[PDB]
């Protein structure tokens, strides 16, 4: 039996750690909801 | 139990110790997570029970106590914050500019940030702190790194 515990408010935090790139990707989505790289 | 808005951890005791299987958002008395986290199972909050109300394996989305409430969208321009909630670790904002999933049915925002699968369900925010979707369903790229969709539901 799974259960939930609160972990924080939902807020924009000015001067948070700014990382990660912005890739453009060709993908397909199956009936099962799993994504896949179309190449 | 606790109905306060904000982000929650999703835990099981069915394995060794207490294990965090994913994350979710309480808003307007509705709890929003990803389907692969709960598998449409009921949840506990204090002595309270949360029963599934809506879900779709293909969207990989599921709401508890009411219909999906989160109707904010990436503008396709501005940066966003992943309010990440990792297992064992404190909530932490990570700011990024999303890439794109190109599909036959349309283009979807994507966030390239790599975190344990237990982080599935963590929300993604616009500059006004509105939830524009959920992290935890996407794809592994050439490098072996993970890239997640910005997964958003439809409100009524
Ligand atoms: N390497 C991986 C594999 C699966 C993942 C899921 Cl399901 C969610 C978030 C990150 C992930 N990273």
């Amino acid at each position: 039996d799974m259960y939930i515990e609160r972990a924080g408010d939902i807020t924009w935090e000015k001067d948070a750690e700014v990382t990660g790139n912005s890739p453009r990707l060709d993908v397909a989505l199956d009936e099962s909801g799993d994504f896949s790289l179309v190449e | 139990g606790e109905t306060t808005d904000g982000v929650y951890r999703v835990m099981t005791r069915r394995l060794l110790g207490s294990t965090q299987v994913g994350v979710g958002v309480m808003q307007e008395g509705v709890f929003h997570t990803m389907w692969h986290v709960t598998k449409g199972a009921a949840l506990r909050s204090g002595e309270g029970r949360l029963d599934p109300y809506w879900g779709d394996v293909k969207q990989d989305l599921v709401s508890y106590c009411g219909p999906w409430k989160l109707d904010a969208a990436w503008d396709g321009l501005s940066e966003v914050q992943l309010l990440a909630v990792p297992p064992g670790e404190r909530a932490k904002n990570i700011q990024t500019l999303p890439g794109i999933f190109k599909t036959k049915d349309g283009d979807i925002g994507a966030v390239a940030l790599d975190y344990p699968a237990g982080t599935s369900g963590s929300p993604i925010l616009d500059k006004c702190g509105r939830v524009i979707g959920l992290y935890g369903n996407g794809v592994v790229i050439k490098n072996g790194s993970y890239v997640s969709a910005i997964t958003q539901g439809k409100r009524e």
Side-chain angles (χ1 to χ4, degrees):
Chain A
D1 222 288
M2 302 173 184
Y3 65 91
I4 62 158
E5 317 193 313
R6 186 157 199 294
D9 292 355
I10 293 155
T11 51
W12 186 272
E13 295 294 281
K14 246 175 182 149
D15 281 292
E17 172 198 341
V18 181
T19 177
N21 63 301
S22 308
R24 289 177 196 261
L25 292 185
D26 268 351
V27 301
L29 175 51
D30 68 19
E31 199 176 66
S32 307
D34 307 301
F35 285 107
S36 53
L37 282 180
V38 174
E39 289 261 32
Chain B
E2 181 160 34
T3 319
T4 330
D5 287 9
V7 62
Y8 287 69
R9 295 183 190 257
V10 175
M11 310 288 317
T12 185
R13 295 215 199 84
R14 217 182 54 87
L15 277 12
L16 198 85
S18 302
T19 310
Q20 185 187 293
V21 305
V23 176
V25 172
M26 193 68 54
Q27 184 160 139
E28 291 165 77
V30 172
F31 192 61
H32 308 82
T33 195
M34 305 208 90
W35 193 93
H36 79 267
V37 180
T38 70
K39 305 287 194 227
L43 304 175
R44 175 171 32 85
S45 178
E47 270 163 291
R49 189 186 164 103
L50 311 194
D51 291 0
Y53 179 114
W54 170 79
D56 191 320
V57 152
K58 188 178 192 195
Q59 296 185 59
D60 187 22
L61 284 186
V62 62
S63 72
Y64 286 76
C65 304
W68 195 267
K69 296 291 176 167
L70 311 181
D71 53 2
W74 187 31
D75 61 359
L77 277 194
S78 340
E79 276 180 5
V80 303
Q81 276 173 30
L82 175 62
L83 177 27
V85 176
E89 301 184 0
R90 179 158 59 269
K92 175 190 40 161
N93 302 39
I94 319 290
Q95 177 152 330
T96 197
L97 181 78
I100 305 261
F101 278 3
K102 271 161 221 182
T103 84
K104 60 181 254 277
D105 292 12
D107 292 3
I108 327 159
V111 298
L113 293 174
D114 198 350
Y115 280 101
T119 338
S120 276
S122 311
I124 299 159
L125 318 180
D126 72 20
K127 278 152 188 189
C128 291
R130 291 173 298 141
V131 184
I132 58 160
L134 299 195
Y135 168 90
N137 200 35
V139 79
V140 166
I141 46 157
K142 275 194 73 77
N143 342 347
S145 186
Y146 176 81
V147 191
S148 163
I150 310 178
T151 301
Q152 185 55 314
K154 199 208 153 189
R155 184 192 175 110
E156 305 291 48

